[PDB]
Amino acid sequence: HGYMYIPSSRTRLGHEAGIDSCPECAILEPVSSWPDLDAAPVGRSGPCGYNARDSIDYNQPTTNWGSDAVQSYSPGEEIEVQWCVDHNGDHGGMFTYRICQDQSIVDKFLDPSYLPTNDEKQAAEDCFDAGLLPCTDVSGQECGYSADCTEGEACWRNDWFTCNGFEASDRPKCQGVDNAELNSCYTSIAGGYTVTKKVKLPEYTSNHTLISFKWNSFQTGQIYLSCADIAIQ
Numbered sequence: 001h002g003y004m005y006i007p008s009s010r011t012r013l014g015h016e017a018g019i020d021s022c023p024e025c026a027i028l029e030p031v032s033s034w035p036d037l038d039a040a041p042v043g044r045s046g047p048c049g050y051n052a053r054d055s056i057d058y059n060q061p062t063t064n065w066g067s068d069a070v071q072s073y074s075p076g077e078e079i080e081v082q083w084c085v086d087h088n089g090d091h092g093g094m095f096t097y098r099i100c101q102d103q104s105i106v107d108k109f110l111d112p113s114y115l116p117t118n119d120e121k122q123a124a125e126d127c128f129d130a131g132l133l134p135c136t137d138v139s140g141q142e143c144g145y146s147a148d149c150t151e152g153e154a155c156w157r158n159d160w161f162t163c164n165g166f167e168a169s170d171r172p173k174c175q176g177v178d179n180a181e182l183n184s185c186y187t188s189i190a191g192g193y194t195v196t197k198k199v200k201l202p203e204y205t206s207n208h209t210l211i212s213f214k215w216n217s218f219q220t221g222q223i224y225l226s227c228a229d230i231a232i233q
């Protein structure tokens, strides 16, 4: 279970506003999450996530998220991106961050008076997939392959990030990436650990667009999606 932490995602804001009791519980399931990381339809989850237990659709702004950019950046800037993983239930896998460079598509996710349909969520997801921010765009960042993949499979791609191996004796799983302290970021279930990387923002301007986080599991069929409202100026 996890969600995007920095920049602050809609999910983070929904928990901090007192609405979402389990920000890490916004899950896309049942799906095939592995090895073809992009084949499963996103359904109601969309690029921003849907939290089933409080019926919270993060693809639509409310007074508590989505009105405005939470943070402003420059085109091409290399930025910190962090997600928070709950200790109970971290089983590794692969994750990524994406920016859709089609403002008219994104705009349907920025309107508090409009709820994107599942078809619109999927077209947006496709735009996000085209706008994936590769690990390898950041000079000096080490971008390895998953210990849960073999060459020839659709998971063998180092544009996505990988968690550490599940089976490692030292620093396994997603928690092992940073080896941070317990409750270094909030989760509701058992306490949270940061998972930190860098991405290079596209050379693109917007006063209000989205960065969408996606995390795919290998051992079970599940995907976690979040999105953050940002500006690139």
Ligand SMILES: *[C@@H]1O[C@H](CO)[C@@H](O)[C@H](O)[C@H]1NC(C)=O
Pocket: 205, 206, 207, 232, 233
């Ligand atoms: C952002 O809005 C300001 C007006 O408040 C405008 O001058 C500027 O060009 C806009 N930037 C983008 C990227 O559209």
Ligand SMILES: [Zn+2]
Pocket: 036, 037, 038, 039, 154
């Ligand atoms: Zn695919």
Ligand SMILES: [Zn+2]
Pocket: 067, 110
């Ligand atoms: Zn607006």
Ligand SMILES: [Zn+2]
Pocket: 102, 103, 104, 105
């Ligand atoms: Zn357009």
